Paper text:
Kinesins are ATP-dependent motors that move along microtubules (MTs), organize them, and modify their dynamics. Kinesin-5s are important for the assembly and maintenance of spindle bipolarity. They are dumbbell-shaped tetramers with pairs of motor domains at either end.
We imaged the HsK5-MT-GSK-1 complex using cryoelectron microscopy (cryo-EM), calculated its 3D structure to an overall resolution of 3.8 Å, and used this to build an atomic model of the complex. The structure reveals that GSK-1 stabilizes the microtubule binding surface of the motor in an ATP-like conformation, while destabilizing regions of the motor around the empty nucleotide binding pocket. Density corresponding to GSK-1 is located between helix-α4 and helix-α6 in the motor domain at its interface with the microtubule. Strikingly, however, the nucleotide binding site itself is empty in the HsK5-GSK-1 structure, and while density corresponding to switch I in loop9 is clear, only discontinuous density is seen around the nucleotide binding site including very little density corresponding to the P loop being visible (dotted oval). Next, using the docking prediction information in combination with the difference density, we applied a two-stage consensus docking protocol, and identified 17 conformations for GSK-1 between helix-α4 and -α6. These conformations were analyzed individually and two alternative conformations—one each from AutoDock Vina and from GOLD Chemscore—were found to fit equally well, with cross-correlation coefficients of 0.62 (conformation 1) and 0.57 (conformation 2) with the difference map density and 0.82 (1) and 0.80 (2) with the full map density. However, the computational docking approaches described in the previous paragraph provide validation of these poses: they are essentially rotated by approximately 180° with respect to each other in the binding site—the trifluoromethyl moiety is directed toward the P loop in conformation 1 and toward the junction of helix-α4 and -α6 in conformation 2. Conformation 1 is most similar to previous predictions of GSK-1 binding (Luo et al., 2007), although our structure suggests that GSK-1 is positioned further toward the P loop in the MT-bound state of HsK5. Interestingly, PLIP (Salentin et al., 2015) predicted an additional interaction between GSK-1 in conformation 1 and α-tubulin-Arg402, which has been previously indicated in motor-tubulin interactions (Cao et al., 2014, Uchimura et al., 2015). The contribution of a tubulin residue to GSK-1 binding could help to explain this drug's specificity for tubulin-bound HsK5.
Numbering used by the authors:
A (entry chain B): 1 to 429
B (entry chain A): 1 to 438
C (entry chain K): 15 to 117, 134 to 248, 254 to 369
Amino acid sequence: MREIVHIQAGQCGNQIGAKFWEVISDEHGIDPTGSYHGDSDLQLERINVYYNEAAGNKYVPRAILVDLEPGTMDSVRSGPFGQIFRPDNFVFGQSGAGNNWAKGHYTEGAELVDSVLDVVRKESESCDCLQGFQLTHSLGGGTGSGMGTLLISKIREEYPDRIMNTFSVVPSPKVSDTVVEPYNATLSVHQLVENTDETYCIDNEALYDICFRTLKLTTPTYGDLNHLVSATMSGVTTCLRFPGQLNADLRKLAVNMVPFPRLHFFMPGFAPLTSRGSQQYRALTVPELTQQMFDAKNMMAACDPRHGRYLTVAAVFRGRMSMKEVDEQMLNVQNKNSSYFVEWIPNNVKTAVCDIPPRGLKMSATFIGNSTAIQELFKRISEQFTAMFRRKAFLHWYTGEGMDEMEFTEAESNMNDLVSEYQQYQDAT
Amino acid sequence: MRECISIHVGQAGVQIGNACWELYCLEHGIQPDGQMPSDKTIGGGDDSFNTFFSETGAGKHVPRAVFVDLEPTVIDEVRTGTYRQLFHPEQLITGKEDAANNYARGHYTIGKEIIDLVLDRIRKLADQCTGLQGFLVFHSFGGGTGSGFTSLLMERLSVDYGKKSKLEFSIYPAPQVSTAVVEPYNSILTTHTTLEHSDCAFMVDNEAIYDICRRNLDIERPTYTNLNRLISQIVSSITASLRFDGALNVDLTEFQTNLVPYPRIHFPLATYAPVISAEKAYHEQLSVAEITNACFEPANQMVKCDPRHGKYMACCLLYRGDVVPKDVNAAIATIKTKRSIQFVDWCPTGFKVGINYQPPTVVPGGDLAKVQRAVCMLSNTTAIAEAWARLDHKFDLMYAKRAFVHWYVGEGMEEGEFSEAREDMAALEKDYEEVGVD
Amino acid sequence: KGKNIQVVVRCRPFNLAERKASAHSIVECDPVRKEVSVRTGGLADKSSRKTYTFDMVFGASTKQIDVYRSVVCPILDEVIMGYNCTIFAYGQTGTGKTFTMEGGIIPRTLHQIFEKLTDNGTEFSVKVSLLEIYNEELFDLLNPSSDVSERLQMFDDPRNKRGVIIKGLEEITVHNKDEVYQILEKGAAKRTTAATLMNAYSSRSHSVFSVTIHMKETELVKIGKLNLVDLAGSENIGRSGAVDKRAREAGNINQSLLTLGRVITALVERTPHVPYRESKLTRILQDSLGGRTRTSIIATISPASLNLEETLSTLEYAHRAKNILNKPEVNQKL
Ligand SMILES: Nc1nc2c(ncn2[C@@H]2O[C@H](COP(=O)(O)CP(=O)(O)OP(=O)(O)O)[C@@H](O)[C@H]2O)c(=O)[nH]1
Ligand SMILES: Nc1nc2c(ncn2[C@@H]2O[C@H](COP(=O)(O)CP(=O)(O)OP(=O)(O)O)[C@@H](O)[C@H]2O)c(=O)[nH]1
Ligand SMILES: O=C1CCc2cc(-c3ccc(C(F)(F)F)cc3)ccc2N1
Ligand SMILES: [Mg+2]
């Protein structure tokens, strides 16, 4: 049990979270009935805990549909496995953030509470305890951020006990549709970061670049990339939920990940990381996964791994690994770079093997660590915001948003304080 | 006769014990159902039988074991397994909430709820059973569960039982690597306090043993199960001696008391010889000298150590298969004459060692081929202490980092306790040195 | 600059609870020495000793008034100068956070403050506030008029980066002593935190009491501020066996006390980043940390051998406090 509520919100997440849930549902292999197509008991139970059983042994997905606009959900519902979710389960505000973090934030909240309360009550009832909640949205886009800001505080607030991780796409520093767009995100995220114990973010640009490049497709599709992302998430859920020869609890890992709880968050990493052609055609050798992970390319976000430093790296292997393989992988890491390895703590990386190899490739791994460069880059973006501040464009709209300037300043300010530490991360090995 | 129960802590504890038990069933030939199609256990309930299980029902043998885990995961497997059918649900218990590899957290949070059931469960068995000569403890140092669980367990068990002997087969993080950052914190913190309560503590060289076994295997990597397999078999040998008299059977504990001159030295390091891989088993027919000599070599040593570096205050020998004391003597001369093993001035005498009539016990599906004789030895060296120190330093570094204070802080555990672990380690090292010196 | 942050250690007379404990006084206070010595044992039996030399050292015997006189009176003059000053009490409840607060200290202080000021003859106003920090949240004690939580948010006022502004709390000025008391009594009730199993009373929340004094004389205008901070302390949850919520809350603070261990290792470090913002307390505190504010610390310790950890932890913190360079400046304003 210990189900976590899945949230899709923000239009991005309106896709992306939906994609994740749906793909996860696909992972369920439960037929669209919501009964369990899959023969496998193991999946069935794990999924089953995840998804409350409707009569007919339907699986009630743990998700809420949030609409920037109501159509978005509609598209979702019209999209596949609409049936699996009972329409009752989700409700979404029509208004949405409006792609304003603040504006969405203020407006959304009233709707938010109503929706959240009902679902949350159900969910709370649903499992004895939830491990935590997962949020999908795009911070960079106005709504993910706008909704998130309002939602996160209360939602986190409701159970201090619960540990929640949030997912948002961070705006690509490379380009933004609008300067303002990341602006909505920045305030949201800044507020968000303290609020949320864990945040998982990948820069859009890098993901697109990597995805695209790897794909060698004309472009990465939004959905596909989301699918990739969801896949990344899914493994974590699947592996942890699923038995593993070595399985690590979220709590231990999470606590472990920060050398102490002070470190707010760690940035996600995915494995195997490969090019579209490369990965698809290629099969991972045992060392193979590690190597891909090791390289910069592996990180979904674009970072130079040297530039970043890893507080820790964690990978979850899925399926069995040879102990020797365990040895080889571990050994390589330390060898590879002194700085890369944290000097302070040996065995920086800890891995768990999923009891069962993932659907598809036998071995899967996740990447854990932070990208120094990436975090720093983001802060720069805020600086861009600062420059924009010189413009003081759309102050009024912000005024309409009702957020004070000071929040803006502080929001940057705290970030500024943190960011320096970020460099420090790299500085430390 | 006497029955023993094993306790498994952490996933590791359960798994390892699991290996132990099934082996027992197989060795008895008792079917995993728990009632052997084979005739009733040897000599009826033999001492071995009773410890392994009891014949009740009647005409069912139910193992004497308790399986505990914070995390539901491993125990559920048991439920799945056929062996599960053997084990009546009373014996097997699972815990909802995993340690999450916090020794303190797991210990405090989990332990409180769990203990009452387990103590009761054990209690009833204990009451019913004639008793154990001793009981075995399984757990993982690294695993939070083992850490937290063991600490809770140790005090309570110690207080209640008092007289009853306690033995802990623990997993010592290989100096090569630690799975988790937590592990050094967990291990040191957990270990020191508990150990004092415990008569003796055992730690495993994951690296050394794994390397050695694997290398002996000449296999890329031993299975974890296989690795466990080695552990089980040796244990079985241990049980066999006490359970069934060998050429020489000795009270294991009583001998052990002889073995450890000091309660100060909770346990001598123990070795099993010959070091037998499957291949190693294949390669030679062991001789008394051969086994002993093999045993001496660090390759045999599961732990990585320089036996030279440590002194041998005394060593014990277990014997398996046919043996004749003459051969033993021949070995004795060989060993004694050999400089290489150093004897502490304190103990002039190698003695004593015991022999088992029955050929060495093997773990089922044993990777390694059978050896004519199995032997185990205890030695006390400074070096062994050093290994602890080796782990300690990293922990010390962690303490220097003062990282992750908070998590423990949530536990309410103090740095001072940790410091105490370190200091205790230091003192212990000093003690080990002091004893170690001849 | 500034005078170094002043740290005094006080060893409590063996608490009656200590007596029930049959706690034994390892602790030896040699006030002449200003040495305090603790039977560590080290590894060894607590023949082994750890000896510290303190700015000021008070054995159990030390009378309360005396302590105050020695520590408060000099502070009061700084307040009148315009100093911003802070005194924080740490250590064991038995040691007498409670022994110190039950009696003054607070009731005594407001009387003296007016007496010194009026004899000074300066035209003055006195405003007081009382808040409690509970589970990282702010709650207004002082004004029951104000909510149980004062509307609490804190921002940087650009004058001092460390310098902060706590919007919404009000101190109400009264020229007279008397008005203050009336508030004082009121405030106290709000202030009170949870009692403990171990101790009849415990401070669940850190209490911050602040008195701001505006002074005008013929024209020079000075503002003096005094913060009297009473530590909130936790006990090991496991030991407590307290309800999970209770344990949790204790754990949070306790853990926070590591985080307070951590920032203070940084101050010693003179490390680039000081984690002020990781606690509301240290952020508020922030400008005081070796800051312009004139700061004094009173660490209380129990002779009892029983609590090794607190004794060790108070010894480490006394070292770490000195390291940070306190730059009290008289904040005299004309
Ligand atoms: N990787 C992806 N990024 C996307 C996708 N759709 C949008 N985005 C990015 O997300 C940001 C826009 O956020 P959303 O899609 O969530 C718009 P939202 O409902 O949150 O608010 P409004 O602006 O009120 O509509 C922006 O940076 C886009 O580049 C997608 O499918 N995948
Ligand atoms: N003797 C063995 N040790 C093992 C085996 N597999 C893992 N380990 C070791 O066990 C340690 C991990 O401990 P556990 O899995 O028992 C974890 P535990 O349940 O105690 O706590 P958590 O999983 O953190 O909640 C670590 O040092 C591993 O290297 C095995 O098959 N045998
Ligand atoms: O690096 C270190 C070592 C631990 C330490 C403890 C404290 C503390 C912890 C607990 C208490 C109390 F509970 F006894 F009050 C007092 C001070 C303050 C600073 C430090 N710095
Ligand atoms: Mg949208």
